[PDB]
Design a protein around this ligand. Structure first.
Ligand SMILES: Clc1ccc(N(C[C@@H]2CNC[C@H]2Cc2ccccc2)c2ccccc2)cc1
Ligand SMILES: Clc1ccc(N(C[C@@H]2CNC[C@H]2Cc2ccccc2)c2ccccc2)cc1
Ligand SMILES: *[C@@H]1O[C@H](CO)[C@@H](O)[C@H](O)[C@H]1NC(C)=O
Length: 333
């Protein structure tokens, strides 16, 4: 029918690392907490057929759904900690009011890491079919198909942690209340991945990395800003940060004095100040403070690349444009 629709999905912000909203699967709807991930293209939730990370999440019960259509084809999703395994199923999925018949994964095996830490149940991949495992049609392609959206775009707002809004996803447009000024666009290197060309990473007023150009994946599913092990070893050396097992730290008192970090994308320099990347949990010289920048070695074909996750998105309201194959950034509000 008439496409003037702009569906808003409200997100919960858990500790500035997990941003999740709800979806409803089946007849009647079974609700799930999901992360909306531009870095992946498959929809998956835990199955009732799950034996132990599962135990801790909401399980989908096909036997309680009148709209369910069996499939059973094996689904295997590679994560950096191991495999998320299950089988395909088809059901009616509700997201921000829009209902679509979707092929999704009913997960029967999850690695304990990171899933034991997850406040959310499953994943809703906002990526392209080119990266969908089993060539399964992604949710956004199916929403596009309905011809309901105002524009063939979706936007992300991630807040900084009080009864305030954790985040928001607008399907069919952007929310001007959550951004200031106008959007600056960067075309995708190629369709099939939410990845753009990056022309430099600067510490202060000097380009220290990516001087000859590199790739930047705009990943809403990633908690932090990430680079390859070698890029982050060099960047952390420049910042004077020290490696620990899972992160890099600075003495808490040294944190507010850390230089600005800039990402050269399109015609602009996108700047993050120390307040945007330091988890300032204290101001003590006797305590250590974590950085919201990590090393993540993304495997080919997508990698090696940088990934602009929640750390970048909190600063810059992001619009994913499928009609035009571009990403737009505006300063978040
Ligand atoms: Cl810190 C952190 C690091 C990773 C995540 N992820 C996985 C990343 C989010 N998008 C896909 C993947 C990166 C990738 C992109 C392209 C190709 C390969 C990998 C996650 C997301 C949701 C649930 C569980 C994990 C989250 C936080
Ligand atoms: Cl692929 C992948 C995704 C996340 C991790 N994580 C957990 C993430 C790192 N700190 C925030 C947390 C958010 C999260 C929690 C659950 C799911 C997604 C993000 C991890 C890092 C070091 C030690 C243990 C866990 C690891 C691999
Ligand atoms: C499952 O879905 C795939 C989608 O390509 C289809 O080819 C296959 O025949 C389906 N299997 C069953 C048993 O429905």
């Amino acid at each position: 029918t008439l496409g003037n629709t702009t569906s808003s999905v409200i997100l919960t912000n858990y500790m500035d690392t997990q941003y999740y909203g709800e979806i409803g699967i089946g007849t009647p709807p079974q609700t799930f907490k999901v992360v909306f991930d531009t870095g992946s293209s498959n929809v998956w939730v835990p199955s009732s057929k799950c034996s132990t990370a599962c135990v801790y999440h909401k399980l989908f019960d096909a036997s309680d759904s009148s709209s369910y259509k069996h499939n059973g084809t094996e689904l295997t999703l590679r994560y950096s900690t191991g495999t998320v395994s299950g089988f395909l199923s088809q059901d009616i999925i509700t997201v921000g009011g829009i209902t679509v018949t979707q092929m999704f994964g009913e997960v029967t095996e999850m690695p304990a890491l990171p899933f034991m830490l997850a406040e959310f149940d499953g994943v809703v991949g906002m990526g392209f079919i080119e990266q969908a495992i089993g060539r399964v049609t992604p949710i956004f392609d199916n929403i596009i198909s309905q011809g309901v959206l105002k524009e063939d775009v979706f936007s992300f707002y991630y807040n900084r942690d009080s009864q305030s809004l954790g985040g928001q996803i607008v399907l069919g447009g952007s929310d001007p209340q959550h951004y200031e000024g106008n959007f600056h666009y960067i075309n995708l290197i190629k369709t099939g991945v939410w990845q753009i060309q990056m022309k430099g990473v600067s510490v202060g007023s000097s380009t220290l990395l990516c001087e000859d150009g590199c790739l930047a994946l705009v990943d809403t599913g990633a908690s932090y800003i990430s680079g390859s092990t070698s890029s982050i070893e060099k960047l952390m050396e420049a910042l004077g940060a020290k490696k620990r097992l899972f992160d890099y730290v600075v003495k808490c008192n040294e944190g507010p004095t850390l230089p600005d970090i800039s990402f050269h994308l399109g015609g602009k320099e996108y700047t993050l100040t120390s307040a945007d990347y330091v988890f300032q949990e204290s101001y003590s010289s006797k305590k250590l403070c974590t950085l919201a920048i990590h090393a993540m070695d993304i495997p080919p074909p997508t990698g090696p690349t940088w990934a602009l996750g929640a750390t970048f998105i909190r600063k810059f309201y992001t619009e994913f444009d499928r009609r035009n194959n571009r990403i737009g950034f505006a300063l978040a509000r």
